[PDB]
Design a protein around this ligand. Structure first.
Ligand SMILES: NC(=O)c1ccc[n+]([C@@H]2O[C@H](COP(=O)([O-])OP(=O)(O)OC[C@H]3O[C@@H](n4cnc5c(N)ncnc54)[C@H](O)[C@@H]3O)[C@@H](O)[C@H]2O)c1
Ligand SMILES: NC(=O)c1ccc[n+]([C@@H]2O[C@H](COP(=O)([O-])OP(=O)(O)OC[C@H]3O[C@@H](n4cnc5c(N)ncnc54)[C@H](O)[C@@H]3O)[C@@H](O)[C@H]2O)c1
Ligand SMILES: NC(=O)c1ccc[n+]([C@@H]2O[C@H](COP(=O)([O-])OP(=O)(O)OC[C@H]3O[C@@H](n4cnc5c(N)ncnc54)[C@H](O)[C@@H]3O)[C@@H](O)[C@H]2O)c1
Ligand SMILES: NC(=O)c1ccc[n+]([C@@H]2O[C@H](COP(=O)([O-])OP(=O)(O)OC[C@H]3O[C@@H](n4cnc5c(N)ncnc54)[C@H](O)[C@@H]3O)[C@@H](O)[C@H]2O)c1
Lengths: 136, 333, 333, 334, 328
């Protein structure tokens, strides 16, 4: 928590959260020295609150941004070409309400019979992953 | 090289300039120096901004003007201020969403709703207590006994729906949530609580049972058992209120649980940025109500950066000028 | 129409401290009230009429006294930090005081004093300087920083156990019940609360969250969620406490929430019988703290028959003589 | 009916409207509105049965004066003249709306010193040892410097020598009030409240004049030039005689102390003051005269039983600006 | 840093409670520290000026002090039952000088003729011919008794002034009155018999001054000169090595003693008991630090103020300090 700068990552309640808030108290009537750390879940965009002491550490989750060529819409999992050239169908389109979902499909369609391919972005945290951007 | 005492001389013609008296209150000396410095602290709060959260956005009710602020304003009001004619100068502050959060004692929460239901009579400080009991008149300013009975008819249904909702929809009621729902229910523009419901302003009373609301909760529990109010969730909400803002300011008028709850909450924030205290209490007894701003800096409730101002005066005299020399100018501006 | 006659000292150099007290009622001003107050406390103790109280827990080695008197002590947080704690511990050990009503800071201080003692100071020290040196201030009394960490370590395991009983054995916790368990846990003769726990003396603080205990409840809620404290059940127990008594006697030392809670509770029997208020406050503000016993009569909190006595002084000066002129005589008697 | 003035949604606030409803706001604000009422009655008391008119004034040209049938006494504590309320007081004396003033030694000394040099502002919580170490004197949150009191010594010592000379040669008998009337006439600064009282023949009485800077000067002069005699016996006859002729009496006591008593004892002669406004910060529980409520004063017959006394429990620095704004200013314009 | 431990009542000794008062916090801490300041004044001896020698009256115990003590009593105190504790101080010459307002001076003499008695409607009290101060009411008949006694002494003082040329002042008149009352009960009689000066610069502000007004229209030419009195009151503190002020209340009594102590460059020991606060800017409400600012209290000295009514604090203060001196 001594290195917990804002804009870095932490696992709060099991949801990868980007630190967007942190307060530190020297000591006081409140009790011994405490610290409130706060972060927004990447998947649900929800900020969460935790309170902890000093001389401790919090789980950090390996998340890597990942672009793959959109090859086909397999009825919600999509054929995706990795940079290595292997094919992954594990990734599914973004859920409903997420306007990304329409921006992926509308851009697959603008591109399907044409010579331009769609590049998606699937930020990947361990097993978890979701298309967060697309582009021609 | 410090400032010179100097009052404003009244006009020979006879048309007094109240605006020029307000400006020269700071240089009169004694408690007038405090009133002028109190106006200055609030002016810093309303006109605060920085380049990166916006507060005072309001609930977007039509026909009302709101101006955005980078400062969060917590107002501590004792029951007296929501029982005196200071209600008109507080409804204005809430209607224009110039105050982000309010903390009030339970009689004050009960008074606004009873005031919107029924009016208050005038009276004297030296009135015989035994006689007033015979006439069933309470004293604070006389609020009649009949007035609480009209209030009872209103509050009992909202709690019954709250009990029904708690069992059926898993709604865990707390004191703040009952007040916000109660304010939405009043639907009277007169209410300071209705405006806070419309403009999304949270109201917190830690001892909500101490007051008329608590007696009504007691009678309802015998008729309909199992209502639960959780302080643990309320202390979770209240303590987090100051943490978010770039700066927070406390206008605590009066003293008591309200002075302590707002100051205690600001400890989690490392201290309140700006503060004005208006009360009639002295620090000799060792009490919290009379504790000077210096004692609050002792336990970390006030930021060492702040320049706290206390006006040792009855609020009924100090606040009408305080709205005139700060909030009225900014909203019209 | 009696004369104003003060005690005249002995020429040789012997001064009977008892003889000074015999003439207090006859010395005028606030001495008149202190002497008249001693009379009301004496009336409470010697009011036995053909309803069992002050029986105590039957602990061996402790003197106990007769029934026919429920005594409610309205103490504020300031008194427990002061050395008036020794007088309160003696009063509850012998069970003359049937109920404890106090704010959250007094509840926290009694326990921290057991873990660690209070220090003196004065009213004139930069509050900024004290906080730099990690020292909280309460009037001229400094409660050190370490005293709050010791309380946290002691209460944290007890709170986890309390949750386990609600989770496994379904015990519905309320604020008075938590204090009684903490009284048994301290198992220390020095604590006022321990004697109340042994003598079955209920402790009722309505806003428990407004203090260190409430701050402690909040930090536990994140690590172990689901702790619930109900005010609905507490108001049923606190309000019904006056109803079961031959007569009810209030000794409100201080003012604010504790004054209203004891008085509002006594409204249930149509008004308390014997009262002594010692507070440094006046009625010009219209505040609850400064109200005269007469305003309380208007609500119906004080019985019409009751002779309310208010000493406009500091309890720290009035209380040592007050026990001397009333309770000590009864125990030896 | 409890009520208030809502500041306008377009931010239009009438300060006059704020003042107009004070009476109906409740608590202390009700007392401030009631206080403005009795002070206005004092100015408008002029009535019809020769006739005795007060406020005729010095007759000085270029200054407005208005005649009134009611006689007004002003009790000023020493702090008020040190405060910026001196400017509001100068307005009443210049237009002669106040017939007589009873002021303690400290206030009398300050008006003459203020003309000589200005008083400085400050905070209540300042080290008393440090303030003395810096050679500064403190009256609340104000700081009158050490050098200023010396200036009063230079001016007063010549006038006192002339007073002794008149007593020896012309047989003049000097009382405290006569000494201040000469001192006011000789200030020569239009700033002085006392200069106007001297010009408009307003008698200023301090019973304990030696209890102040003037008294150390009087004492110091005695050793150099012995013989000065100040007779309280003549002053007591004049001051008690003051209330008799007036058709009605207006007692405005700001503060408490000997000044509240001096004027109040005098009002017993005509059986009591007819209109009284007291603004102070003291409580009757200690039995003191200073904190005594109007009712305690009614007990000894100092206030007319008919009179409705008003007490506002507040520092005067905050209540007097509204009291002058809501009463005398409008009457002079009328 | 000392601890906070109150006296533990025995499962009562009033003397032991008084020892722990300094340790019970708040205003009790001050009442305990105040008793200490009074003790220090009595037990201060410095080899070189003895004071409190007394009047030599037979049967009365008197003790030498290298300390001069000034007691400033507001009028309300002499009016109450505190008169007995003040009388004890003067009988044993423990207080060298007294400054009191015309009400206390008139009160001691009036009580000797007729006694003082113990929310009351103010209008009703005038209807019953009653004068009310706090909860103490002085009957209107009592003032007439004072009138009969003072008038002949005033006529004699004018006659002495006319023939023997004695120039009168307010202090001289009070000593003459104490000689006339001739009652050990009177605080002023023991002050006079013991040669203890009493000052009152606004003596005309009270019943004594109103009595002077009525006398002048019958026997004119009486002169009460303030100039001579200020010289005596200001010169009172200069001769000693140490001076002690016990000011019960605030006002002219507080200012007159403090201003006089400016001439010695400060008063060594002080105890203030008044229910007053500094917010109003008033002289009475001023805490000791304002009084230190003029230079009235020695910078070296440690001042004490008990924010309490004197009626509660003084009975414990005499018990905790002076009674020990006479016992010694
Ligand atoms: N009118 C009432 O005061 C009222 C009404 C109903 C119930 N209650 C209950 O009383 C308890 C204590 O009330 P509280 O916490 O509001 O404190 P309080 O009303 O006792 O006030 C405490 C202090 O606040 C200051 N103060 C209060 N009103 C003031 C005013 N108008 N002007 C200047 N200073 C003022 C004074 O210094 C006073 O000593 C709470 O439980 C509350 O619900 C009070
Ligand atoms: N030590 C503390 O004061 C302390 C500590 C922690 C929390 N708190 C919180 O502060 C809030 C209110 O504080 P409080 O309970 O101390 O009451 P308070 O400070 O509001 O006291 C109210 C009134 O009681 C009277 N009074 C207080 N102390 C007195 C004394 N020693 N002698 C005579 N009269 C006295 C005065 O009239 C005073 O204005 C509560 O919610 C409490 O939990 C206080
Ligand atoms: N600035 C000074 O007060 C001052 C200066 C020099 C000499 N003195 C001498 O001190 C003696 C006592 O002074 P005093 O008789 O003027 O009394 P004071 O100034 O001590 O005031 C006495 C009481 O008047 C009331 N009061 C005073 N100022 C007030 C204010 N601003 N607002 C409201 N109430 C207020 C309060 O009840 C106060 O306790 C006199 O002999 C005077 O000459 C005082
Ligand atoms: N008994 C009377 O009050 C009385 C009687 C006749 C005439 N007078 C005249 O009234 C004038 C003013 O009276 P004063 O200057 O003696 O005092 P004061 O009335 O000005 O008292 C000033 C302050 O002293 C404090 N105080 C007074 N008595 C106290 C007590 N017993 N315990 C604690 N604090 C106390 C209070 O804070 C009070 O506000 C004098 O000139 C006097 O002659 C008064």
């Amino acid at each position: 928590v001594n290195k917990l700068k804002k804009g870095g990552y932490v696992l709060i309640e099991g949801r990868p959260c980007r630190v967007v808030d942190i307060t530190k108290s020297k000591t006081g009537k409140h009790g011994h020295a405490k610290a409130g750390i706060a972060g927004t879940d990447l998947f649900t965009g929800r900020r969460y609150e935790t309170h902890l002491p000093t001389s401790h550490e919090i789980e950090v989750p390996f998340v890597d941004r990942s672009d793959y060529g959109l090859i086909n819409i397999d009825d919600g999992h999509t054929q995706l070409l990795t940079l290595d050239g292997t094919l992954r169908e594990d990734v599914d389109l973004p859920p409903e309400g997420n306007e990304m979902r329409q921006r992926v499909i509308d851009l697959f369609n603008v591109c399907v019979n044409t010579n331009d391919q769609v590049v998606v972005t699937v930020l990947s945290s361990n097993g978890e992953n979701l298309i967060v951007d697309c582009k021609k | 090289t410090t400032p010179l005492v100097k009052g404003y001389v009244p006009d020979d013609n006879g048309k007094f300039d109240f605006d020029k008296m307000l400006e020269q209150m700071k240089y009169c000396g004694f408690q007038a120096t405090n009133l002028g410095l109190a106006i200055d602290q609030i002016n810093e709060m309303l006109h605060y901004d920085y380049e990166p959260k916006l507060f005072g956005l309001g609930g977007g009710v039509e026909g009302v003007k709101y101006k955005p602020r980078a400062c969060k304003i917590f107002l501590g009001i004792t029951s007296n201020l929501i029982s005196s004619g200071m209600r008109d100068y507080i409804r204005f502050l809430v209607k224009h969403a110039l105050v982000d959060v309010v903390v009030c004692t339970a009689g004050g929460i009960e008074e606004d709703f009873i005031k919107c239901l029924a009016p208050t009579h005038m009276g004297e400080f030296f009135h015989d207590g035994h006689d007033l009991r015979k006439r069933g008149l309470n004293r604070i300013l006389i609020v009649p006994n009949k007035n609480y009975c009209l209030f009872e008819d209103w509050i009992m249904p909202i709690l019954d729906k709250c009990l029904e909702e708690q069992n059926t929809q898993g709604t865990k009621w707390t004191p703040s949530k009952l007040i916000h729902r109660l304010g939405l229910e009043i639907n009277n523009e007169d209410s300071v609580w209705y405006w806070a419901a419309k403009n999304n302003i949270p109201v917190y009373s830690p001892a909500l049972t101490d007051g008329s609301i608590g007696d009504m909760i007691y009678f309802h529990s015998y008729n309909n058992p199992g209502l639960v109010l959780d302080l643990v969730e309320d202390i979770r909400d209240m303590n987090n209120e100051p943490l978010w803002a770039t700066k927070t300011g406390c206008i605590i008028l009066g003293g008591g649980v309200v002075k302590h709850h707002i100051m205690n909450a600001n400890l989690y924030r490392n201290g309140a940025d700006f503060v004005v205290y208006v009360n009639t209490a002295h620090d000799f007894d060792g009490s919290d109500s009379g504790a000077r701003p210096d004692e609050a800096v002792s336990w970390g409730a006030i930021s060492l950066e702040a320049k706290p101002v206390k006006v040792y005066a009855e609020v009924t005299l100090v606040l009408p000028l305080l709205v005139a020399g700060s909030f009225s100018k900014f909203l019209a501006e």
